[PDB]
């Protein structure tokens, strides 16, 4: 049992016997990769063998199992370098990703490109195909250039393995040719372009990923297959019931769409329109506000949990940060935070504003072991909660609060007592939500 990172300098987390949840392993993973509390929910555990994701609440018990720490949730053109496509941003009282997440995504992107989890798009013509191969050489140049730039200093290990096997089938002269062309690209890029266009590492990673969005098939999207699909509203009933024949695609920007497996994708729903999701065995039922619903049969209960985890996560990212659509995949932290009236890693400004409107409890934007109370630090040590500086802990946040409310809190030349908590409200705006 081990959790793997696409970052090279980061060794994998090995786990001993005992129970874990995917969430806390993701917490540990985040801390290991210096991923901020803000970006944590963008990540999840992926089993490269079963090709399934873990729900935040999935219990893991220790055998030998290789799980992958992956950025799962994605919004095309988060980078904003695509002047044609849509613009993505976090609300402010602001980009989606921070440097940590960006680095990890870059590493993951390289991994996906090379190992072909991000398969290169199909060619429209021979010429287009060659152009694609050339772009791949470009990508290799970007990767290498970035590596050299980072440490202050062959293309084979930086291109999709498919293209590698393809190139290995051509005559030796052509391979020498490809080498020469690549060397020329690399040289010309590092000698002229880096300086001329003042290309930083950031720009580099951005162009790389931005290029992945157009170079590869369905980047950042998750496609699920089914042979039993039902869409029903007060206007229509479409019942598809034939090998699998139908596809349901999930993306952050467009939401839930579906089609016949080779047609243009049909829009079923964006996430804020969803009221709830029910799972029964392999059957997933998604319900919208206008009572329009989708039902589909997946291949297992696990795949159902995977799917609903994806949709629920996106809902949390786009609609309501402190809500869950399905008990089966309900993240422990979201539940416990709902129960304790505690906010996610919101900006302090939001907290202040919320106080102006009508104390506030919020997780820290800096580290995972702290709850900020509005500014005062509360420490969370291995299941136990306590006030920073003190030496008395409690089995839960509630008990701490109960004890805390009875105290006269003193700051420099000021004394007061905690009054009431302004807990989160439904679908309220904050930097935890992605505007699209």
């Amino acid at each position: 049992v081990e959790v793997i990172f696409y970052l090279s300098d980061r060794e994998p987390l090995r786990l001993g016997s005992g129970e874990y949840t995917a969430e806390e392993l993701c917490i540990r993973a985040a801390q290991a990769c210096r991923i901020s509390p803000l970006c944590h929910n963008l990540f999840a555990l992926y089993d490269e063998n079963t090709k399934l994701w873990y729900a935040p609440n999935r219990t893991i018990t220790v055998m030998s199992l290789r799980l992958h720490y992956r950025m799962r949730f994605y919004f095309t053109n988060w980078h904003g370098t695509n002047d044609n496509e849509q613009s993505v941003w976090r609300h402010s009282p602001t980009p989606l990703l921070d440097a940590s997440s960006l680095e990890y995504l870059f590493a993951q992107g390289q991994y996906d490109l090379v190992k072909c989890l991000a398969p290169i798009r199909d060619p429209k013509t021979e010429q287009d195909g060659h152009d694609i191969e050339n772009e791949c050489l470009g990508m290799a140049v970007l990767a290498i250039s970035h590596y050299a730039m980072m440490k202050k200093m062959s293309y084979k290990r930086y291109i999709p393995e498919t293209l590698n096997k393809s190139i290995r089938q051509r005559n030796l002269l052509t391979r020498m040719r490809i080498n020469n062309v690549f060397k020329d690209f690399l040289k010309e890029f590092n000698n002229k372009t880096i300086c001329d266009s003042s290309v930083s590492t950031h720009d580099l990673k951005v162009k790389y990923l931005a290029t992945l969005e157009t170079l590869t098939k369905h980047y950042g999207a998750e496609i699920f297959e089914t042979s039993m699909l039902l869409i029903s509203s007060e206007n229509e009933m479409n019942w598809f019931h034939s090998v699998l024949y139908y596809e349901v695609m999930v993306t952050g920007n467009l939401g839930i769409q579906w089609r016949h497996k080779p047609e243009e994708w049909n829009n079923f729903s964006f996430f804020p329109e969803i009221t709830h999701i029910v799972i029964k065995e392999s059957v997933v039922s998604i319900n919208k506000q206008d009572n329009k619903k989708m039902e589909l049969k997946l291949s297992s209960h696990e795949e159902a949990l995977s799917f609903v985890s994806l949709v629920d996560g996106y809902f949390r990212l786009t609609a309501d940060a402190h809500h869950y659509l399905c008990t089966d995949v309900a993240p422990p932290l979201i539940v416990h935070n709902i129960q304790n009236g505690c906010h996610g890693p919101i900006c302090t400004e939001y907290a202040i504003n919320k106080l102006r409107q009508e104390y506030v409890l919020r997780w820290s934007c800096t580290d995972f072991d702290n709850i900020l109370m509005t500014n005062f630090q509360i420490e969370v040590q291995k299941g136990r909660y306590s006030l920073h500086g003190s030496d008395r802990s409690f089995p839960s946040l509630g008990d701490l609060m109960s004890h805390l409310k009875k105290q006269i809190l003193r700051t420099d030349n000021i004394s007061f007592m905690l009054k009431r908590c302004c807990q989160p409200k439904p679908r309220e705006i904050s930097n935890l939500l992605v505007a699209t």
Binding site: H130, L142, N171, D203
Partner: peptide, 29 residues
């Protein structure tokens, strides 16, 4: 033929390596 394939077209810089800049200019004498 050894060179009878697309890779022996004239080199063209991949657009992925094209980092555009405003490049405004002024003529000062």
């Amino acid at each position: 033929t050894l060179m009878g394939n697309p890779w022996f077209q004239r080199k063209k810089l991949p657009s992925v390596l094209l980092f555009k800049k405003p490049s405004p200019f002024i003529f000062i004498s």
